[PDB]
């Protein structure tokens, strides 16, 4: 229900890709970027028009110019700081989002922009967490920027 792989994300080919957000849903740090760049202003546009959130809830809009439908904006920080529940809850909340929508194929990114204030390995722990307690009809996929890096993160989903 989770593979691993090197990539871009701006260049995933399926349903939707989650992205990390502050609260605010104001684009720009991290990932986002190049999914602004890549993706044109339709969405922060659509953003703006969904207006504010909580934090540990997520929230959707359009792909732009993207070959994904789908951007499942999930809520880590912002009027709070990111914390291994806020992450716990940003990532729930993406994923019934998708469900909602009734999608098979999604994927995030490390989260890593997001989380330095946190312990690597128990972020993920929690995502992961969460991505084995969504539902089959779900295919998920992690995008990591190194072969290293994405064998490293397949080598450790062999812990167990
Ligand atoms: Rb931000």
Not at 94 to 105: C, M, P, S
Not at 115 to 126: I, N, Q
Request: hydrophobic share 40%; charged share 25%; with cysteine.
């Amino acid at each position: 229900r989770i593979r691993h792989v090197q990539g871009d994300i701006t260049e995933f080919q399926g349903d939707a890709i989650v992205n990390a957000a502050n609260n605010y849903l104001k684009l720009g740090a991290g990932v986002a970027g190049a999914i602004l760049r890549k993706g044109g202003p339709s969405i922060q546009e659509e953003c703006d028009r969904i207006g504010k959130i909580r934090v540990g809830e997520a929230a959707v809009t359009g792909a732009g110019n993207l070959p994904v439908r789908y951007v499942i904006h999930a809520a880590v920080l912002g009027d709070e700081p990111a914390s291994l529940e806020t992450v716990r809850k940003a990532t729930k909340s993406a994923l019934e989002k998708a469900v909602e929508l009734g999608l098979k194929t999604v994927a995030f990114t490390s989260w890593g922009a997001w989380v330095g204030g946190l312990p690597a390995e128990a972020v993920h722990r929690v995502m992961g967490e969460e991505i084995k307690k969504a539902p089959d009809t779900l295919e998920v996929t992690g995008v990591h920027g190194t072969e290293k890096s994405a064998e490293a993160y397949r080598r450790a989903s062999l812990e167990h």
